[PDB]
Amino acid sequence: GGLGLIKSLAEKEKQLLERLEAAKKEAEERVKRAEAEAKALLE
C-alpha cells in the first residue's frame, strides 16, 4: 500500500537524516576540540 511506501521511505530518510545530524554534531565537537587545544597552545 501507498502508506507502506510512505513507511518504507520514512525508514530510510529518518536513518539518513539521523546520520546527517550525527555528522553536524560531530563537526561541532571538532570545532570545540580545535578551539580548546588552540587556546591552550597559545597560552
Partner 1 sequence: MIAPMEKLVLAGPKGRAKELLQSLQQAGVVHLETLRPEALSAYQLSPEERAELRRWEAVSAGAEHTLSLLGLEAEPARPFPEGLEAAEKALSPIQAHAEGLTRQKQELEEELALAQAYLEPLERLAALAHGLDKSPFLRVIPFLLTEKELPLVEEALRKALEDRYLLAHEAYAGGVAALVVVHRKEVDQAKAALSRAGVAELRLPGALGELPLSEAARRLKERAEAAPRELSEVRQHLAKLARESASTLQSLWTRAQDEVARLKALEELASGRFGFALLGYVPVKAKPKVEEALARHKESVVYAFEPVDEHHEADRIPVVLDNPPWAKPFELLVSFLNTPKYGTFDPTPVVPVFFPFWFGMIVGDIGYALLFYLVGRWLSGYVKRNEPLVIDLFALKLKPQVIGKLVHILNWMVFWTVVWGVIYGEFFGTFLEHLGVFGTPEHPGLIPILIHRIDTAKTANLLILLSVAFGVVLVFFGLALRAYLGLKHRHMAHFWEGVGYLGGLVGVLALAASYLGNLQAGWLQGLMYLGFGVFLLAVLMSRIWLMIPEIFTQAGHILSHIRIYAVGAAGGILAGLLTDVGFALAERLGLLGVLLGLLVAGVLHLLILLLTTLGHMLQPIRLLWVEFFTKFGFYEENGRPYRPFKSVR
Interface with partner 1 includes 22 (CB under 8 A)?
no
Exposure string for 2-11, b = 16+ CB within 10 A, e = fewer: eeeeeeeeee
Residue found under cell 555528522: 23
Q: Does residue 24 interact with partner 1 by CB under 8 A?
A: no
* Smallest separation (angstroms) from partner 1 to the CB of 34: 30
What is the rounded distance in angstroms from the CA atom of residue 33 to the CA atom of residue 43? 16
Q: Pick the closer one to partner 1 by CB: 7 or 30.
A: 7
Binding positions for partner 1, rule: CB under 8 A: 1-6, 8-10, 12-13, 16
